[PDB]
Structures are given as C-alpha cells and as structure tokens.
Design a protein around this ligand. Structure first.
Ligand SMILES: O=c1ccn([C@@H]2O[C@H](COP(=O)(O)OP(=O)(O)O)[C@@H](O)[C@H]2O)c(=O)[nH]1
Ligand SMILES: O=c1ccn([C@@H]2O[C@H](COP(=O)(O)OP(=O)(O)O)[C@@H](O)[C@H]2O)c(=O)[nH]1
Ligand SMILES: OC[C@H]1O[C@@H](O)[C@H](O)[C@@H](O)[C@H]1O
Ligand SMILES: OC[C@H]1O[C@@H](O)[C@H](O)[C@@H](O)[C@H]1O
Ligand SMILES: [Mn+2]
Ligand SMILES: [Mn+2]
Lengths: 274, 274
C-alpha cells in the first residue's frame, strides 16, 4: 500500500529524471524506497564500499564511517573495504548487524595524482570482490553522509553528475581535449560531466571500468601525457563509450560551502568535508 | 554528435517518464534512438515477435506483417513466430534483410477465452526461443504498426499501459478482485493497469512470466473460477509482484477510433484494427 503513481502528473517536473538512453537519473521524489528495499532484500544483496585513506587521509575515516553507518544502505548487507598505508590508524567504529569492514594494506604512492590515479589499479584485487559482494561503490574518503544513500543507486553501472557542471553546456565540460590522451573527448561529444568521487555498479562492471581506466592511464604514461583531471578524465571517457545504466543527481555529491543548498536539491546526501 | 541532454530542462514535463521503482516509462522525447540503436547493434540483438492467428484472425496477418516490416525493429534482426491453426493461410510478405518468419502449427481451442488464455501456455516451446532470439515481444495480431516501435522497448521485462486506464485511479482498475483467483489483487494495491496485448522482455523473463501465468490459470481451473479478464488478469498480477524494468506508454497500444489523438500522445505507434 503506497501512493499510486499517476502517469499524467509527474512528481519532478523541474529536472531531467531519465537520460536519452533511458537510464534513470536519481533525484528525491523519483523513487519509492520501500519498493526498492524489498526488491533488493529479496535477493539478499551485499554492497561493497571502497574507500582509500592513504597518508593524512586516515583522518577522514572516523566521520566517513560513522555517517556511512547512519545513512548508507541501512538494512542491507554492507562490506567496507578500507585501502590504507596505515592499518593501525583505522578507527574502530561499531557497526550495525550484517555490516563488516576489511582493512587492505597498500603502498603510499609518490604524489597525489598517483594516489587518486592508482585507485583504479588497486580496485582492479579481483577474485575476492566477485565472491563477497554483488555491487561495488567507489568513493572519496574526504566526505560525510548527511542523508539517505541506498539501493536506489544500485544498477549495473552508474556515475554521478559533478556538482559544478550539471547546469552547464558541454564545450564547458573539463574533459581531456588533447587527442594524444586515451581520455580524449572531442568538442562536439559528451553527455554529462561525471565526478571521479562517486561511481559504481555490479562487481563485473566496476572491474571492467577500473581495468579499462588503468589500461588507458598506463598507455598515456608510456606516451608522456597525463590527462587533465587524471582518473576523472578517463572515467568520463569510459562512461561516454559505455553509458551508465543509472546516473546519480548532485544530491549524491555536493559541497554546501561552495554551492549552498539550491531548491532543485531536496536532499544533500553525501558532501565534502573542508 | 547529438543534442546535449540538460539536467535542468526536462523534455517531457507533462507525463511520468520513470516509475517509482526506477523503470523508464517510454514516451516520445525520452529517448535518443540513435544512441540506443548503436547499443543494441553492438550486441547483434535478435528480437522475436510472437503473434497468434487462430481461425478467422489469419485475416489480420497481412497488414500486421506488412506494417511490422515498415516500423518494428527496423535495422535489427527480427524473427516472427506466427502461431496458427492454418499454415497455408499465412500471407507471404517480403521481408527486409536479417528478418525471418516461422509458422508454428497449433490447435484451434474451444472458445475465445481459451485461445487468448492458452497463448501463455503456447509461448512457454521453450528450448527453441533461448537459442534463436535475445528478446521476445508478445502482441495481438488484430493491430497495425503506424510509427516506430524499436529497441527503446527492450529490457528484461516490460508491460504496456492499457489505453483506457492510464489516467485512472487504482480502485478503478479492472483487476481480479475475488480472493478465490490466483489473479487476486486487493483494492489497496496495484501500480498500473497493463494490457495483455503487448508485453515482453528477455527470453528468460518472458518464459518465466508465461510459465507463471499458465500455472496460475490452471490453478484457477482446478478451482472452478476464471479471472475476470482472463490472461490480462494474471498478467497484471505477475507484473504487480515482479515489477517490469520498462513500462511502455499508450503510444504503444492505442485505438484512435475510440480515443482520438490527444496532445499527450506525440505518436500513435501500434493501433487496433476495427
Ligand atoms: O594523500 C592522499 C590523496 C588522496 N587520497 C584518496 O584519493 C581521494 C581523492 O583525493 P582528493 O579527495 O584529495 O581529491 P579531490 O576531492 O580534492 O579532488 C581521496 O578522497 C582519498 O580517498 C588519499 O587517500 N591520500
Ligand atoms: O479466434 C481467435 C481469438 C483470439 N486470437 C488471438 O488472441 C488475441 C487476443 O484476442 P482479441 O484480439 O480478440 O482480444 P481483444 O483485443 O478484442 O480484447 C488476438 O489478437 C489473436 O492474436 C486468435 O488468434 N483467434
Ligand atoms: O573540472 C574538474 C575539476 O573540477 C573541480 O571543481 C574539482 O574540484 C576537481 O576535483 C575536478 O573535478
Ligand atoms: O478492463 C479490461 C478490458 O478493457 C477493455 O477496454 C478491453 O477491450 C478489454 O480487452 C479489457 O482490457
Ligand atoms: Mn575528495
Ligand atoms: Mn486484440
């Protein structure tokens, strides 16, 4: 027993709720969470969440993890995978039932470009995700959850609209524009500008995507060019060619300090920390 | 190179384009057919179309088939499966490249209820669909195509909004309301009223659906009740419990003689014949 959807009275008339390849764009008021929760519960869905916390970024884990417990996939099985050069630095956060955390120890890379960039490499570690989770969600650690982020996001492949470019035209998009880079996207192409900080999908699609992006980055290195926004550039080139089956609205990646809280955002769910 | 989708200016503001379980509702202006065509071509998609033409309904095949050739999945591989008690009566219609037709001979059933109802049984013939097509589309024969019906419909499971109930409230829906019938749907439930004349999906999902509906009809027979709208009733009960991954708007099942051509319908694609 829920509100009857009515085909002649849309809920959101202010935003695009479907892409032109028929992928939902996820905004508050587009979904009934109760229907979706049942769907995903009926398959005993397990969602993995990957997060890197290399060098000083271990400082962000406590709030990340505490807020994930309040807001992320609450009621579903969750497995956190914390990639860190400092395992002893990972805070012990008490978890809800059916939720667990693994610490994966990795190398502290040369500069920030590589730490951000080698995530694609480090996520692709492959045998294990396939056995343990049905979906993988890949996010920045320097963030907090402030509202529901749940199974509405889950789909074979998704990316998230960069909060600075959702209202913008495409020649404005900061894609890689040098044809020397595997990340190259011409000035007459592109659907959206996706942020590197929040993407995911089924384990098979995320392994594909991260393998591709790593193979593309290595090809650029061997040719002496570094895409302008690094992993985000390659992410955007992958998602142009392999279109995501859901797109998350900027409700899912926001910075209230830089951008306020406009009326088109009914919820701010996952936000940057200073 | 196509129109850039703009996230703050929806194309359709007059209709619901997404269900509350995040299934697209397919209306003109929600999709770019060029993007979709490429997607489906890249997988060499084959679509099967099943149609029953038992007794006098062989009379409808010539126009059905001629118009399907102009409008249905044009450019993609298509396999028509014509179920008939009269194989010699099937018109020879010249087909486009990559399109073929098989005649399947079956029994002329006792009354019209059973002819319509035993379709579910006759579609479920199982080994063969799995090998030959990726999707199955199941329609009435007493119809003509008048405009594009293409790969925008394709998804694991879809149904179509009955053209007489899309603007209506749910207690108005002519679901089966006797609890004695497997088709029973309470007065406080239901998302939409789907018509029996146009549903489909992947071969696996259509085999599931048609197996379920046949198993449900047989259980009702053994109990001496016949659902009020027969196969359509069971279809609607299946789609309540297993929600379709796309819903087709009434653009995909219309009767211009009974309903005109309202402004909310930008195309009339598949329509009833007198
Ligand atoms: O020294 C570093 C730099 C980056 N990161 C990881 O790489 C992500 C992206 O980096 P950052 O957040 O600095 O990029 P921004 O959001 O500022 O563009 C971070 O959230 C961390 O998960 C890290 O763990 N240690
Ligand atoms: O004598 C019959 C009655 C029905 N049908 C098939 O069952 C479908 C549904 O029947 P009908 O079109 O009469 O139902 P309606 O659309 O009038 O509700 C038809 O399109 C045919 O495909 C048939 O082949 N021969
Ligand atoms: O334009 C691309 C850049 O946009 C900035 O706003 C953002 O901080 C960068 O991380 C990168 O996304
Ligand atoms: O209400 C259910 C009935 O609605 C009629 O308009 C239609 O002709 C019937 O075929 C059946 O769908
Ligand atoms: Mn960050
Ligand atoms: Mn009919």
């Amino acid at each position: 027993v829920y509100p009857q959807p009515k085909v002649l009275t849309p809920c959101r008339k202010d935003v695009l709720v479907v892409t032109p390849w028929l992928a939902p764009i996820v905004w508050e008021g587009t979904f009934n969470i109760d229907i979706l929760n049942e769907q995903f519960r009926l398959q005993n869905t397990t969602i993995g969440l990957t997060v890197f916390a290399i060098k000083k970024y271990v400082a962000f884990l406590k709030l990340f993890l505490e807020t994930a417990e309040k807001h992320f996939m609450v009621g579903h099985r969750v497995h956190y995978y914390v990639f860190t050069d400092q395992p002893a630095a990972v805070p012990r956060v008490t978890l809800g039932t059916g939720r667990q955390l693994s610490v994966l120890e990795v190398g502290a890379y040369k500069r920030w470009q590589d730490v951000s960039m080698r995530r694609m490499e480090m996520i692709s570690c492959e045998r294990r995700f396939l056995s343990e989770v049905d979906y993988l969600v890949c996010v920045d650690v320097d963030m907090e959850f402030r509202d529901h982020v749940g199974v509405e996001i889950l789909t074979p492949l998704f990316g998230t609209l960069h909060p600075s470019f959702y209202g913008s035209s495409r020649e404005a998009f900061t894609y890689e524009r040098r044809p020397q880079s595997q990340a190259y996207i011409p000035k007459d192409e592109g659907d959206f500008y996706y942020m590197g900080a929040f993407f995911g999908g089924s384990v098979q699609e995320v392994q594909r995507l991260t393998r591709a992006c790593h193979q593309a980055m290595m090809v650029d290195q061997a040719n002496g060019i570094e895409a302008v926004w690094h992993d985000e550039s390659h992410l955007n080139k992958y998602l142009l060619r392999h279109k995501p089956t859901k797109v998350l609205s900027p409700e899912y990646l926001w910075d209230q300090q830089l951008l306020g809280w406009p009326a088109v955002l009914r919820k701010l769910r996952f936000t940057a920390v200073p």
